[PDB]
Design a protein around this ligand. Structure first.
Ligand SMILES: O=c1ccn([C@H]2C[C@H](O)[C@@H](COP(=O)(O)NP(=O)(O)OP(=O)(O)O)O2)c(=O)[nH]1
Ligand SMILES: O=c1ccn([C@H]2C[C@H](O)[C@@H](COP(=O)(O)NP(=O)(O)OP(=O)(O)O)O2)c(=O)[nH]1
Ligand SMILES: O=c1ccn([C@H]2C[C@H](O)[C@@H](COP(=O)(O)NP(=O)(O)OP(=O)(O)O)O2)c(=O)[nH]1
Ligand SMILES: [Mg+2]
Ligand SMILES: [Mg+2]
Ligand SMILES: [Mg+2]
Lengths: 162, 162, 162
């Protein structure tokens, strides 16, 4: 129960298990970035299909932070599982159930998810709650020219298509 | 106009409305992680098709930060809308128009986007501007062994496929 | 070799080039959020197919941070290249090779990746290593009501489908 001096600053996350039959989300290994979310339900996804899957939890992301729902890498490579809105963006004011928009990006093999499978991971990070300052031009804001300028969308090269 | 003591530290984001006919991006609710980006154009996406869509804004993400373009959850589940390069990564030096690489992941129904629809959200976060230190092995860097080791890509289990 | 007073706080990332024939990952422009990852191999992706591609590097993300593998925007729009598990989540304890789960989201044109192409970018950010506090209800935790409440999944509108 002792908070190591190292962890004095670590953030608490209130969580409600809407489905008490599932374990609390946990990190697979010390230092892992996210806690794994469970599926509360059985669902089968044919190739190309998506589903909105309940995780059985609600959280209270602190004000000034964001929760982020990321796909797991193993299911992504092994069976083509993804998340339509990845990274899913959990707002600090949200008090509903976290759901995951799973999608089967494999062309031929269905994906079967069972209740209690670990289907995604939840990260928590600080976010800047931006105050927009509208300007007529970045010059007017007295901003210096930058190296990148308006270069984007492959401008630096690195593939034959670019 | 008073900055609450709580918000003293909040980050300003210079923004140019390249399309002045669109509202400034805004947070839907207090504490929300992102501001919603508008489409500056009408575009129809057949199943499987993608488009590079103008948002009508340019921003100056502060040095030491990153802008992040995330899909909205409702369009993702309701109509299969996604973003090919999600999360889109807006560099601090970028001064061009923010564009969104929308894609229709539904197998059968086209997606119609109208000018003035909210099609994505923009977050701003700090980023570590990494100094790489090349080493011959993590041992040489005197790094301690870790629990995870070289485990990845589903190593912790949690689905029948893994 | 002088660390500018401005960069005193900048984070070092230990890296092993498992494939020494590839350049170290680098930022395309000052201030860019990520370093570009190379492919260590040649791979051809037919429409809809995915592959697990080696980058030739291993890193040691600091404890309290996360590495994030993001797609590049140019390949995403030009040829439909994406990443199945985007954003890929590199844990601080991981000492294996970084791999990228590339996928071809174009319906008709194959994507050819050559060894030495820049196929993704790696960001490093702080992460909150969450301590979960289970509560019976957010009321019990004495949390105030929020504007958003349980609204999600398009609740704020902004498209005809919502
Ligand atoms: O969703 C996005 C992503 C990028 N961009 C712009 C801003 C960003 O700084 C720039 C380059 O983004 P990436 O580095 O993610 N893509 P890529 O490496 O292909 O382009 P470049 O070669 O210019 O770095 O493109 C957008 O407008 N929207
Ligand atoms: O794009 C990625 C993502 C993950 N990885 C490696 C490093 C990360 O620490 C490890 C596990 O990532 P995930 O936790 O996102 N996937 P999963 O939960 O399936 O694997 P594990 O069960 O090992 O945690 O896989 C990559 O090499 N590239
Ligand atoms: O993966 C996710 C993403 C969002 N959500 C919930 C929490 C988040 O606060 C809420 C809204 O998320 P978005 O803002 O990303 N989507 P959208 O803009 O469509 O919904 P809203 O109009 O309610 O903001 O939906 C999930 O449960 N899982
Ligand atoms: Mg994992
Ligand atoms: Mg929203
Ligand atoms: Mg780039």
């Amino acid at each position: 129960g002792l908070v190591p001096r190292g962890s004095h600053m670590s953030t608490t996350l209130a969580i409600v298990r809407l489905d008490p039959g599932l374990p609390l989300p946990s990190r697979a290994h010390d230092g892992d970035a996210g806690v794994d979310l469970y599926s509360a339900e059985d669902v089968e996804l044919a190739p190309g299909r998506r589903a909105l899957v309940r995780t059985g939890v609600a959280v209270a992301v602190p004000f000034g932070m964001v929760g982020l729902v990321h796909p797991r890498s193993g299911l992504a490579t092994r069976v083509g599982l993804s998340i339509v809105n990845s990274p899913g963006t959990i707002d600090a004011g949200y008090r509903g159930e976290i759901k995951v928009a799973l999608i089967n990006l494999d062309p031929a093999a269905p994906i079967v998810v069972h209740r209690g499978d670990r289907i995604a991971q939840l990260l928590v990070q600080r976010v800047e709650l931006v105050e927009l300052v509208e300007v007529s031009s970045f010059d007017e804001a007295g901003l210096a020219s930058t190296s990148r300028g308006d270069g984007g969308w492959g401008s630096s090269g690195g593939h034959a298509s670019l």
